[PDB]
Amino acid sequence: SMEQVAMELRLTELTRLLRSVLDQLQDKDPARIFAQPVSLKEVPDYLDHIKHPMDFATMRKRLEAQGYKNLHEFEEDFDLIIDNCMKYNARDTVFYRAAVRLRDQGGVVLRQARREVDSIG
């Protein structure tokens, strides 16, 4: 149907906008701390601590399959990156501190993304 096509075009357009958002957020992680999944070979107890691991590579795979239906879903995954790190790592670590800086800098990007998503529909 034409209605299904139109809904598909909207998903494609959201996907484009979320790719630009993802790029902007990942620039706020210049150390690449959050670029890839925590390795279970290197942190073998990780899944005893963290129930829903997340990272930028994993988000990028989901995005390229058009797997985010709305900005809320995308933000959920971004917040898991931050929130997982702030539980597993202590305050005095480079990991925790990187998460805080990514959260603070990313809030700005997400604030305007929400306006764009709402505005364009």
UniProtKB/Swiss-Prot annotation:
Record's protein name: Bromodomain-containing protein 1
Biological role stated in the UniProt entry: Scaffold subunit of various histone acetyltransferase (HAT) complexes, such as the MOZ/MORF and HBO1 complexes, that acts as a regulator of hematopoiesis. Plays a key role in HBO1 complex by directing KAT7/HBO1 specificity towards histone H3 'Lys-14' acetylation (H3K14ac), thereby promoting erythroid differentiation.
Cross-link type Glycyl lysine isopeptide (Lys-Gly) (interchain with G-Cter in SUMO2), residue numbers: 41
Subunit description: Component of some HBO1 complex composed of KAT7/HBO1, MEAF6, ING4 and BRD1/BRPF2. Component of the MOZ/MORF complex composed at least of ING5, KAT6A, KAT6B, MEAF6 and one of BRPF1, BRD1/BRPF2 and BRPF3. Interacts (via PHD-type zinc finger domain) with unmodified histone H3. Interacts (via PWWP domain) with dimethylated and trimethylated 'Lys-79' on histone H3.
Tissue expression from the record: Highly expressed in testis.
Residues of the full protein shown: 555 to 674 of 1058
Organism: Homo sapiens (Human)
Bromo domain ranges (all copies): 9-113
Subcellular location: Nucleus; Chromosome
